[PDB]
Design a binder for this molecule. Structure first.
Ligand SMILES: Nc1ncnc2c1ncn2[C@@H]1O[C@H](COP(=O)(O)OP(=O)(O)NP(=O)(O)O)[C@@H](O)[C@H]1O
Ligand SMILES: [Mg+2]
Length: 518
């Protein structure tokens, strides 16, 4: 039936994607963000999800952070109601509020009701943890069409199932809260996790916490041991400044932590303006980073392969944007370049969306080529396909040829554009047509009409026709692996018939364009 959205339900952040026009699109939340914090808060008996919850996660004690850690268990989380009574919530219920929020903004963005999803989980998730996640989906009104592993979703996003060979893929995933490295075997559409190793208390939060310690040490040095660890608002600001500083250090060699009026003492306002260099940050966080190294070696050994047998390495998770992380992974597989070309905080959701598209059976996923797959032609006298841009021409490109009229005293020319390898235009795919009129009366072969086929870097086709005497011109702009193969097959299947046709066709004299009333 309807669309199947792909959901990465992360410990720290969540992300929702869907197939639109044969490409996966990541949907922005109402604050314009492509990921949403996996945080739920409660105030005045109102449920607050995402960015607005994160902004009060220290200051509002009703805030539920890292609920994914309790998924698959019978633990309950307590929150206070407005009246001071206590409410108990299951991990399923809290996760369902995150899913409902994603679902709601997805619906408003797409403009349709959504009732189906593919939801991702860590490779290590057992049945209790997977079933908890499925139940969360059900509570949010989503038929959970499949639960897939996060590294499997990443591999799907990178098209690794299209390799037509056995692929051994290392997926290094460093998120906000968790670290995983999984070794996948991918052959004939089957994904097997050969090994998974990691730490669910090691992620970007821990790097932030080292910056918090650095700021705190500076504060104490500059203000006689001043300690804000029990000041909730100050700690809210420190956590946010620390994450911001870290993110800047992925693109800068230094950053300034700016916290005016962090508190006020008897002596006055405490204003922090503190430099942190990338080098210092890396030194402080070295023990955290180094905890991710041995597990790489461990999964390779578990899978009973050598490092040189790894075909591809994928970087997943927002923390893999850190230069020290990328360099560490590179160091562990000499001669292989880790892939991070798909935004690593979106790649899992993208893979989930791709899986959704597959399960729906839409089969629409288009290609993005830098060379023309099929020949582009104009219809000439007798229904002949006269080529303008030959197949396998690198785009962008413009090609021109001059044509004449097919009949004496012809007033206009039809410009019929077709795609395919067959010699008769009717046997190829019609891409569109237009007419160019105002041609002055003359014998057939006398008028001269310049035809130009132009393909831009985006692969969009502009066909222009200019009468070289009158200077009048008209044009049009023209708006799938299986369809390309179907057309090549049609030519292959009629090769002998078409050769006989071609033997009657001489393209070397000036071509002529007909006009037929419609
Ligand atoms: N440019 C960047 N540089 C450094 N860290 C970043 C960057 N962008 C995002 N992050 C961090 O990436 C982490 C979030 O990763 P993300 O993959 O979105 O979380 P997740 O999928 O919930 N994984 P987990 O928390 O392990 O379940 C946070 O610690 C962010 O601060
Ligand atoms: Mg993720």
């Amino acid at each position: 039936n309807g669309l199947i959205i792909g959901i990465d339900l992360g410990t720290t952040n969540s992300c929702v994607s869907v197939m639109e026009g044969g490409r996966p699109v990541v949907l922005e939340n109402p604050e314009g963000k492509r990921t949403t914090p996996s945080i739920v808060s409660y105030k005045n008996n109102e449920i607050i999800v995402g960015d607005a919850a994160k902004r009060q996660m220290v200051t509002n004690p009703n805030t539920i952070v890292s609920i994914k850690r309790l998924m698959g268990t019978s633990n309950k989380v307590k929150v206070q109601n407005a009246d001071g009574t206590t409410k108990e919530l299951s991990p399923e219920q809290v996760s369902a509020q995150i899913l409902s929020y994603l679902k709601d903004f997805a619906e408003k963005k797409i403009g349709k009701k959504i009732s189906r999803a593919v939801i991702t989980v860590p490779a290590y998730f057992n049945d209790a943890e997977r079933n908890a996640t499925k139940t969360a989906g059900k509570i949010a009104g989503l038929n959970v069409e499949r639960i897939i592993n996060e590294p499997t979703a990443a591999a799907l996003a990178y098209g690794i199932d299209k390799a037509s060979r056995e692929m051994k893929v290392l997926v290094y995933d460093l998120g906000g809260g968790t670290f995983d490295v999984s070794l996948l075997d991918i052959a004939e559409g089957t994904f097997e996790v050969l090994a998974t190793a990691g730490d669910n208390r090691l992620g970007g939060d821990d790097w932030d916490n080292k910056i918090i310690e650095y700021i705190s040490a500076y504060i104490a040095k500059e203000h006689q041991g001043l300690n804000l660890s029990k000041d909730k608002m100050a700690m809210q600001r420190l956590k946010e400044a620390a994450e911001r500083a870290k993110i800047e250090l992925s693109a800068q060699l230094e950053t300034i932590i700016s916290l005016p009026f962090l508190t006020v003492t008897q002596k006055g306002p405490v204003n922090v303006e503190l430099k942190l260099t990338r080098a210092k940050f890396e030194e402080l966080t070295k023990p955290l980073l180094e905890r991710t190294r041995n597990p790489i070696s461990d999964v390779i050994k578990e899978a009973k392969i050598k490092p040189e047998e790894i075909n591809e390495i994928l970087l997943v998770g927002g923390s893999t944007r850190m230069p020290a992380v990328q360099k560490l992974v590179e160091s562990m597989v000499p001669g292989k370049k880790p892939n991070r070309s798909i935004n690593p905080d979106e790649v899992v959701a993208i893979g989930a969306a791709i899986q959704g598209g597959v399960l729906r059976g839409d089969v629409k996923d288009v290609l993005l080529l830098d060379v023309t797959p099929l020949t582009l032609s104009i219809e000439t006298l007798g229904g002949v396909a006269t080529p303008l841009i030959k197949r396998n021409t690198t785009i962008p490109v413009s090609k021109s040829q001059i044509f004449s009229t097919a009949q004496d005293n012809q007033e206009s020319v039809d410009v019929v554009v077709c795609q395919g390898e067959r010699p008769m235009s009717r046997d190829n795919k019609s891409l569109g047509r237009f007419n160019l009129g105002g041609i002055q009366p003359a014998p057939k072969g006398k008028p001269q009409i310049e035809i130009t086929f132009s393909l831009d870097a985006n692969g969009i086709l502009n066909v222009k026709a200019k009468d070289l005497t009158t200077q009048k011109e008209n044009s049009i702009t023209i708006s799938s692996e299986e369809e390309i193969q179907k057309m090549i097959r049609d030519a292959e299947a009629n090769k002998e018939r078409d050769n006989i046709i071609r033997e009657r066709i001489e393209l070397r004299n000036e071509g002529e364009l007909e006009h037929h009333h419609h």
